[PDB]
């Protein structure tokens, strides 16, 4: 189906404890594939997926230079933003940036992204048109004026429409045996008495990839959104994901409840019931 590539970057200042920490990771869909941490003993961008390992030494050198250079620009920017916000050198502050591309099943660009945050709130974002900016406050307006002068939006457009889509296409092919083979969830329904008159039904989805899934309880064919406890999808740590949904039901009314599972790895959406 559709695919994505994203780079995430975080710098955190630490007054009195040396220079800011910089951490960046790269993903293809939900698969982590590269990482860099400025606090590593000898910092280099490193592989985290087997299909990226085939990239040559020139690839790793370039990626590492970019990460180091980005770490430096974020250090400068943290100092600049203290001036923009009239903040003291006493506190820890955070810069985040994410960029990347979404493509359709044909590998054509659907949407490009480039967006930033300061202390966990929107700072400046490239609009979907890839030619204009949304600046969140008066500080980000200063950045917007600088970036308009330097035609940053036009340069991001060229990157996102070109390099981003093409490298994504390359990675998808190189990693096809794992990236383009959806693992459907393994599913089961459990039953847990609370008292003599009620019980919990929990619908489980395990070992699935990608992370996107819909898990819903229905009673008599109607969605029970209000009464459903639904946990955040969570990583198993082996590149697959886990999720559950639970409802509390009257004793003996269990057959009225069906759990509905949608995931791209399933031939057909599932309808599950508790089997006594």
């Amino acid at each position: 189906g559709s695919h994505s590539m994203r780079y995430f970057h975080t710098s955190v200042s630490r007054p009195g404890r040396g220079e800011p920490r910089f951490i960046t990771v790269g993903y293809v869909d939900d698969t982590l594939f590269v990482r860099f941490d400025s606090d590593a003993a000898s910092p280099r961008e490193e592989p985290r997926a087997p299909w990226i390992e085939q990239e040559g030494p020139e690839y790793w050198d370039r990626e590492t230079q970019i990460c180091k250079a980005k770490a430096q620009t974020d250090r400068e920017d943290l100092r600049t933003l203290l001036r923009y916000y009239n903040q003291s050198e006493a506190g820890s502050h955070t810069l985040q940036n994410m960029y990347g591309c979404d493509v359709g099943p044909d590998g054509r660009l659907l949407r490009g992204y480039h967006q930033d945050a300061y202390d966990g709130k929107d700072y400046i974002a490239l609009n979907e048109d890839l030619s204009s900016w949304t600046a969140a406050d008066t500080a980000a307006q200063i950045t917007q004026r600088k970036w308009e002068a330097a035609r940053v939006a036009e340069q991001l457009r060229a990157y996102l429409e070109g390099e981003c889509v093409e490298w994504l296409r390359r990675y998808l092919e190189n990693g096809k045996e794992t990236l383009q083979r959806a693992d459907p969830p393994k599913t089961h329904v459990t039953h847990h008495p609370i008292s003599d008159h009620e019980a919990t039904l929990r619908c489980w989805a395990l070992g699935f990839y990608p992370a996107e899934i819909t898990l819903t309880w229905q009673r008599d064919g109607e969605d029970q959104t209000q009464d459903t406890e639904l946990v955040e999808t969570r990583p198993a740590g082996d590149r697959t994901f886990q999720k559950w949904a639970a409802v509390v039901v009257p004793s003996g009314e269990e057959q009225r409840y069906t759990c509905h599972v949608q995931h791209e790895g399933l031939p057909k959406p599932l309808t599950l019931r508790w089997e006594p």
Partner: peptide
Amino acid sequence: SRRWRRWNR
């Protein structure tokens, strides 16, 4: 593959 060019805020 990452973008090479960088700009200060």
